[PDB]
Ligand binder design. Sequence first.
Ligand SMILES: Nc1ncnc2c1ncn2[C@@H]1O[C@H](COP(=O)(O)OP(=O)(O)OP(O)(O)=S)[C@@H](O)[C@H]1O
Ligand SMILES: Nc1ncnc2c1ncn2[C@@H]1O[C@H](COP(=O)(O)OP(=O)(O)OP(O)(O)=S)[C@@H](O)[C@H]1O
Ligand SMILES: Nc1ncnc2c1ncn2[C@@H]1O[C@H](COP(=O)(O)OP(=O)(O)OP(O)(O)=S)[C@@H](O)[C@H]1O
Ligand SMILES: Nc1ncnc2c1ncn2[C@@H]1O[C@H](COP(=O)(O)OP(=O)(O)OP(O)(O)=S)[C@@H](O)[C@H]1O
Lengths: 189, 579, 390
Amino acid sequence: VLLFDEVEKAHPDVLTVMLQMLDDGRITSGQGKTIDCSNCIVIMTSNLGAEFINSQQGSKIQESTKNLVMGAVRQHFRPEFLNRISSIVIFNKLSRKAIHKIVDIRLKEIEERFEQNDKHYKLNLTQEAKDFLAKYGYSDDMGARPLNRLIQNEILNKLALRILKNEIKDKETVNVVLEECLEVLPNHE
Amino acid sequence: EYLSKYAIDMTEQARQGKLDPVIGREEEIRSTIRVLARRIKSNPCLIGEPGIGKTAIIEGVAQRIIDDDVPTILQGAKLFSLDLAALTAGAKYKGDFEERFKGVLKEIEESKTLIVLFIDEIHMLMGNGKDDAANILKPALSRGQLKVIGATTNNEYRSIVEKDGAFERRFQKIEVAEPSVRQTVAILRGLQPKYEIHHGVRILDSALVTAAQLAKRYLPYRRLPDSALDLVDISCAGVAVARDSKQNVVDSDTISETAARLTGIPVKKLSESENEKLIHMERDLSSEVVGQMDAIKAVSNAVRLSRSGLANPRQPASFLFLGLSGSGKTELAKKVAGFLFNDEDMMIRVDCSELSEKYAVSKLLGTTAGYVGYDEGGFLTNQLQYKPYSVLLFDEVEKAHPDVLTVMLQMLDDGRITSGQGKTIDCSNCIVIMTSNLGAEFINSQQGSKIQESTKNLVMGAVRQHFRPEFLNRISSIVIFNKLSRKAIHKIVDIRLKEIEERFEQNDKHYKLNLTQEAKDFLAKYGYSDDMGARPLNRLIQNEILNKLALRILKNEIKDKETVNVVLEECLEVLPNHE
Amino acid sequence: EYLSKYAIDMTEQARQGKLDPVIGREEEIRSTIRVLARRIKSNPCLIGEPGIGKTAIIEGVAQRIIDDDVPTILQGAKLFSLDLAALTAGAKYKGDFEERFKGVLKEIEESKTLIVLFIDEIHMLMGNGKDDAANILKPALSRGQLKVIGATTNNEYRSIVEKDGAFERRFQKIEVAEPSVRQTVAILRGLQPKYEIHHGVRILDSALVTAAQLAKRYLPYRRLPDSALDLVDISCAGVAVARDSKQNVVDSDTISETAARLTGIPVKKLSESENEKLIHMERDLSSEVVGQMDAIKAVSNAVRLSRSGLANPRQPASFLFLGLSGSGKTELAKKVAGFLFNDEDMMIRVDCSELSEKYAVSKLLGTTAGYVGYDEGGFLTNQLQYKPYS
Ligand SMILES: Nc1ncnc2c1ncn2[C@@H]1O[C@H](COP(=O)(O)OP(=O)(O)OP(O)(O)=S)[C@@H](O)[C@H]1O
Ligand SMILES: Nc1ncnc2c1ncn2[C@@H]1O[C@H](COP(=O)(O)OP(=O)(O)OP(O)(O)=S)[C@@H](O)[C@H]1O
Ligand SMILES: Nc1ncnc2c1ncn2[C@@H]1O[C@H](COP(=O)(O)OP(=O)(O)OP(O)(O)=S)[C@@H](O)[C@H]1O
Ligand SMILES: Nc1ncnc2c1ncn2[C@@H]1O[C@H](COP(=O)(O)OP(=O)(O)OP(O)(O)=S)[C@@H](O)[C@H]1O
């Protein structure tokens, strides 16, 4: 899989090369060899449509709203490029409904990525922690990014300190007031 | 026999138990077996990055042959490696090595059961215009004779086959995978007794795991089969050294410390008795800079997260510091570098004012192959490959032209910052601080020394109206500095005077001040700028106090312990050649 | 014994002494040893910038080896400095140097205790298109004992491994770096008797300190061991001349005059004539600057701060001269240079009406990588490299 991060920023000369790679596949090397990329999947990304998606006109992007986005992609990129893409997909807004599910996923991935995959959460407050994060992390026009940051800001930062103080082994738990915070394990570890 | 002179009987080394075992790699071994079992052109070649076990795999099949876990074609086999000596022994007497090589190949084909030749570093035979290659193996391999096993690096291969053609025809490349972390541990475990025996140490399973985990995360320039072993082997050596330098059980901490010594990642020192500093780094930073506690706390958490290992393995800490000039934005970054490595010059500074979107991206990451110049990326590439745990500072990012701000996106996300020569940095161990004065517009609304809502949001307004959201969304925390309060100024003056006094290399050059509050209040009254912050305190001191000192030194009116007095216009007293 | 025709037996020299003491490098040495003590990849490298003790480390470990202050594995090991003719003796006939390299490794590999090579300049082997081009002759056997300690700067290192790809998977980089200023002094101190003996002069302990501090605050292009040692050696040579003329390295005067000679920077010379220096300048300037004493004093104040060290080492003094057109402020800047250097034309200047967003930064500091024109430093650093204090 090839990934091109923010193709809208690439100078057009680049895109010009990619035109062959994306269609026909005979990208060649600087030394004169033919590579042939046709067995790859290519994903290119850009944010031009953000300017219209932020209008909140649908979670799933609505007709017209999508055309505003297509307007921008056509204004920015040569059609020679756009025509060669198998498909242009306009992402949906991550609605509050979505954030509820996303919170779950992120909490799980946070545990999964630990090196010390011992220090898991219990969380408690399934509905309250989920809701706290779902509400406070819902900066819709920033997608799910704020959520990740919220969890970091409210849970992990505190956790790290509690760890330095040996206040936690595992099964970490969350309380809420009113402001989401962490508890301690009386048994230092 | 020439094989006894220009080759190594790998089968015999395996027979004698002198080779390390191959752990798994069944798909690769099977692939080489199938190729060796071919009717024609039975010449597999292992292609992959260096350090992934290619040679080991071939030694692996030698072991399968030793124990008859191979096809009958291979059961009768003897495997020899080819020494470079076939050629490197010299070509005086033109054609001498050509004959030596022709000779050994003759002996290999000639009757004596199945002989398999392993040629390590197969690109060795590219040949200067071929000729030295002498294509001696070429027609031989084309007849299905001399089964040859090759092995080389992805790009070495490229330089062979794309400069030859025949190589691609003569060999069947087999990609060798880099093992997963889980597999890596299994490999280490399999090799563990070899190390335990060699070093005279015990290795615990958590050690094996630790090496594989740390290696993937902290040794990005070396593939797991080696990186994990390097951590184990070196840690074990550390035990051996320790014993002889004046118990022998290698564990996770043993390795973590070792890794820190090799990678520079301070997290892995695991010096928990130093948690006092990490826990209280907020007070420590507050002893150098005054107030601005939100910035201190924001940073402190970056550090604590990294120390705890909780920090996202791919997301360098990132900050955007907003506020008045003289607010302490840069000063804090210096003190962070100070705290983390006991060195304010540890910092890698990039001055964004020198940027130009038409040129300057290359100042950080360099240019690509072809364009004039190389030693690329003086600011980032050539620093980050040496000090992954350093603090980067990007001064005045709001002045950066957009293409540079675009570069920052890699840095602030994943850390996989690419380099002009097609290489990657992977700066996930980094802490990155950026500064900006966009907020000057609203922070100088003076709506509380501690900036309040609305005003703060207007600061974010300026940020949002300047930087693309794509950038802002990658900042761990955007921090708006507070305007210094008069009280802060007082404290700053005290600390700043302390720094100045401490700075002297000659212990005559100091003050007692007198006017223990009054001198400081003068400095505040005459240096408390709502739009220059503390910076004028530095200048005020230099002009009204240190120049008077310079005059006093010059005229020998001051010896030491100088004191301050005030006109109406702060001035200094005289402590002449009496002392 | 091919090795004996090409390499220097560092162990034998250490056995006979004839080596400098090694100061503060114990940990680089411990790391070197630890890697050498490894089961397989026992190939450490001393890496940094020139003049940072990379070969000092080797003399150091050679001495630790002589005294059995090394692990079992190294207890009886020997070490040889090779490179050199190993790659050039074979000036004719294909495969000749290649044979030597191989013969040397053979000599090392077989029986004769543990022999460790020291490669002073691994980049010289490089692997010039691989295909038997020297460095490439090694890798086959990098596992087979043949332990070797390498050495290279970071630029050289990066060039090698980027072009090669295998060495960075075979060798263990050890960071070697310049010492702190105090550590530098300890080094200078350690070599102090060497210089004192060869020049027949004494070095004041305070001269060692001055050289260390000075180098840190004087020569940004030279790493502290060499930089401070050169300040010491250069000074010692000057003292030796005084000794011969009819002594010691004077912390204040030998080093300051040496430094003043080598670079300049009025601050590093600091004249003793305090009754007039930094006083008379206001009168001299007053004659040039009639009435506007305010500017003179502003400048004089900064000048006075730089002298005797009140000025902050990282804050070049600087002024903005605002005022009535035709005030004479440009000449003032020159007249100040007059006093500062006894040279009104010492300065570097830029016509700012020539500056534009399209090019100005590069006109001032030079273009960057890949762009036309390598007049590095443009209008400014192009000149600062010659006169840092102008
Ligand atoms: N079972 C195994 N799987 C993978 N690697 C192993 C295994 N056993 C040992 N190793 C070590 O893995 C390292 C990889 O190096 P080698 O395979 O010898 O060299 P390489 O991987 O072929 O890369 P080059 O081309 O020799 S730099 C070796 O140092 C082996 O000691
Ligand atoms: N809160 C503070 N505590 C102590 N010293 C401070 C503080 N704020 C500013 N200073 C002084 O201000 C000087 C550097 O201040 P900064 O505000 O970081 O400079 P700066 O304005 O960041 O420069 P920039 O970032 O390019 S505008 C130092 O010499 C500090 O002594
Ligand atoms: N402890 C020491 N022992 C020997 N030499 C020292 C020592 N400390 C500093 N030096 C100086 O450093 C020189 C050799 O040390 P290095 O700093 O490695 O020089 P170098 O850069 O290794 O030499 P090359 O060949 O250019 S790498 C000596 O000639 C001394 O002048
Ligand atoms: N206050 C002063 N400071 C310095 N020089 C002065 C002053 N008053 C008169 N002069 C004389 O005026 C002449 C110097 O003039 P210039 O410095 O060329 O003019 P200028 O005002 O610097 O032009 P600028 O700076 O580009 S507006 C010399 O001959 C000085 O002696």
